[PDB]
Amino acid sequence: ADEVILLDFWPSMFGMRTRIALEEKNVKFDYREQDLWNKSPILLEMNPVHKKIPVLIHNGNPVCESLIQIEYIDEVWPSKTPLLPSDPYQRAQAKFWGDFIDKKVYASARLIWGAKGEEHEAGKKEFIEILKTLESELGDKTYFGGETFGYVDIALIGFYSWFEAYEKFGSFSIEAECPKLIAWGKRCVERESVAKSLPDSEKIIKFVPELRKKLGIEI
Amino acid sequence: ADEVILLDFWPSMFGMRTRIALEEKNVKFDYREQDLWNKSPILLEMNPVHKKIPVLIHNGNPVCESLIQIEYIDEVWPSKTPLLPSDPYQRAQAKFWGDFIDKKVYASARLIWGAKGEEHEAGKKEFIEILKTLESELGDKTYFGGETFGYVDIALIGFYSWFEAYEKFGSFSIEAECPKLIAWGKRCVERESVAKSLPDSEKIIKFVPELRKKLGIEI
Ligand SMILES: N[C@@H](CCC(=O)N[C@@H](CSSC[C@H](NC(=O)CC[C@H](N)C(=O)O)C(=O)NCC(=O)O)C(=O)NCC(=O)O)C(=O)O
Numbered sequence: 001a002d003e004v005i006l007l008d009f010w011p012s013m014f015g016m017r018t019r020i021a022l023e024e025k026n027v028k029f030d031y032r033e034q035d036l037w038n039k040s041p042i043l044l045e046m047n048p049v050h051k052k053i054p055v056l057i058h059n060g061n062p063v064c065e066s067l068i069q070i071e072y073i074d075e076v077w078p079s080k081t082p083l084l085p086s087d088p089y090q091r092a093q094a095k096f097w098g099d100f101i102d103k104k105v106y107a108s109a110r111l112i113w114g115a116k117g118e119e120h121e122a123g124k125k126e127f128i129e130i131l132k133t134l135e136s137e138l139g140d141k142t143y144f145g146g147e148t149f150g151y152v153d154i155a156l157i158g159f160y161s162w163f164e165a166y167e168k169f170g171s172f173s174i175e176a177e178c179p180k181l182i183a184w185g186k187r188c189v190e191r192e193s194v195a196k197s198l199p200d201s202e203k204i205i206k207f208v209p210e211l212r213k214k215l216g217i218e219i
Numbered sequence: 220a221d222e223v224i225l226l227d228f229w230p231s232m233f234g235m236r237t238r239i240a241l242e243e244k245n246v247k248f249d250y251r252e253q254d255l256w257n258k259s260p261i262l263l264e265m266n267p268v269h270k271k272i273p274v275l276i277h278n279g280n281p282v283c284e285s286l287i288q289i290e291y292i293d294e295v296w297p298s299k300t301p302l303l304p305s306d307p308y309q310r311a312q313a314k315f316w317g318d319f320i321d322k323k324v325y326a327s328a329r330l331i332w333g334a335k336g337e338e339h340e341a342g343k344k345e346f347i348e349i350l351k352t353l354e355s356e357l358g359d360k361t362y363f364g365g366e367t368f369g370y371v372d373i374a375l376i377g378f379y380s381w382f383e384a385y386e387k388f389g390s391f392s393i394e395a396e397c398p399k400l401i402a403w404g405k406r407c408v409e410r411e412s413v414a415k416s417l418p419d420s421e422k423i424i425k426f427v428p429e430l431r432k433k434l435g436i437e438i
């Protein structure tokens with residue numbers, strides 16, 4: 001009777017964030033796969049402004065934007081170990097890195113599998129620099145959240161599911177460039193929340209050609 | 220001791236947010252005008268990732284990104300009413316609208332004063348549609364924050380200082396399109412925090428031609 005619905009699209013690293021946050025809080029939810037090429041009434045009713053997934057619907061009330069949903073989850077299901085720190089400065093730094101990930105990672109990553117030529121190579125270069133900036137922030141910590149798996153980890157880890165695809169389509173190795181970020185990603189995939197929520201990496205690889213066709217990309 | 224330094228640029232609607240938040244809290248701060256064409260060592264040290272103003276420096280600790288700074292300010296210093304609601308759902312709605320403003324308003328507004336031709340006319344049209352969306356959200360409420368002036372009001376009000384400029388350089392009338400949004404803006408500029416923080420609309424108009432030259436825009 002506390003009802004939680006998640007409107008989502010399986011390979012979305014953004015939706016993965018809200019799957020993971022929910023699993024971390026042990027919240028039971030109803031996952032509803034959406035067709036973004038034939039948008040459903042419920043998606044169009046719940047996110048009228050942007051018409052995007054994920055949408056988290058809690059007792060009929062929609063919360064849009066994946067990072068906003070992580071924070072809402074953290075506040076509504078509070079725990080001994082919070083996803084966001086209570087210290088205001090440390091909270092602001094977590095928000096900063098979430099904002100950074102939203103601004104930077106996807107746009108460069110998309111040029112790896114979804115473009116060709118000069119644009120593609122410039123996208124690969126920028127994507128690696130962005131990862132190195134994140135790897136420098138992580139430093140020698142277990143998680144971006146320090147000893148605890150937190151907001152920034154959740155913000156980034158959905159992208160990890162696509163790393164095999166980025167390596168394949170960009171003919172390069174992320175482990176060679178960012179070994180510590182790889183070690184971090186392996187650690188996070190050992191968590192139940194993450195292992196449950198991320199699709200298989202090969203499934204993503206298999207889907208890229210179909211996805212390219214659906215997005216009008218000819219490669 | 221408590222030291223609050225704000226690295227800023229006078230006509231920035233992003234920096235205006237942080238000025239207004241600090242004034243709502245009655246905080247004593249040191250405002251430090253920055254030359255974005257000859258960036259200072261402090262700006263570069265305090266915002267190494269983006270190298271952008273505003274930067275809020277609290278006892279030597281920097282906080283980057285204007286909306287993040289409003290939230291930090293709200294958590295750190297007391298006021299009669301908070302800038303963000305304590306209800307998680309309302310808080311998430313406020314975040315939603317702040318994110319919407321950051322994603323949409325500037326990119327269209329920039330085409331009004333900073334472009335010519337088809338691009339300019341399309342920018343004016345999109346800017347109007349964005350304002351109408353915002354005006355529908357506001358509805359018949361006194362503030363976006365309902366009865367209390369808050370986060371969303373602060374997120375948008377800096378752009379109000381530029382409306383006379385947008386109408387002049389776009390040869391159009393926002394009041395004709397969005398009268399309730401104009402009423403809102405007039406109401407907010409009566410708040411002492413806002414009146415102290417916004418430049419004179421005329422000072423902005425007088426600056427546009429210089430600003431165009433500095434940005435390499437020929438009009
Ligand atoms: N900030 C929101 C972002 C949520 C979001 O983007 N949701 C979309 C699906 S997540 S898969 C990544 C996405 N891809 C698409 O949107 C595919 C279709 C789109 N037409 C495209 O060409 O990319 C993406 O990030 N794309 C790039 C871009 O946005 O510039 C979604 O629901 N899309 C529906 C749509 O019609 O676009 C959050 O964090 O929640």
Ligand SMILES: N[C@@H](CCC(=O)N[C@@H](CSSC[C@H](NC(=O)CC[C@H](N)C(=O)O)C(=O)NCC(=O)O)C(=O)NCC(=O)O)C(=O)O
Pocket residue numbers: 228230231232233234255270271272273283284285286325434
């Ligand atoms: N999200 C941050 C945004 C803070 C930010 O953009 N700060 C810049 C000053 S605010 S004035 C509007 C700004 N204009 C510029 O950046 C001028 C120079 C720029 N090179 C340009 O041509 O636009 C803006 O919004 N520009 C549009 C854009 O950035 O896409 C700032 O410090 N700029 C420094 C710079 O070198 O760019 C927040 O909310 O705080």
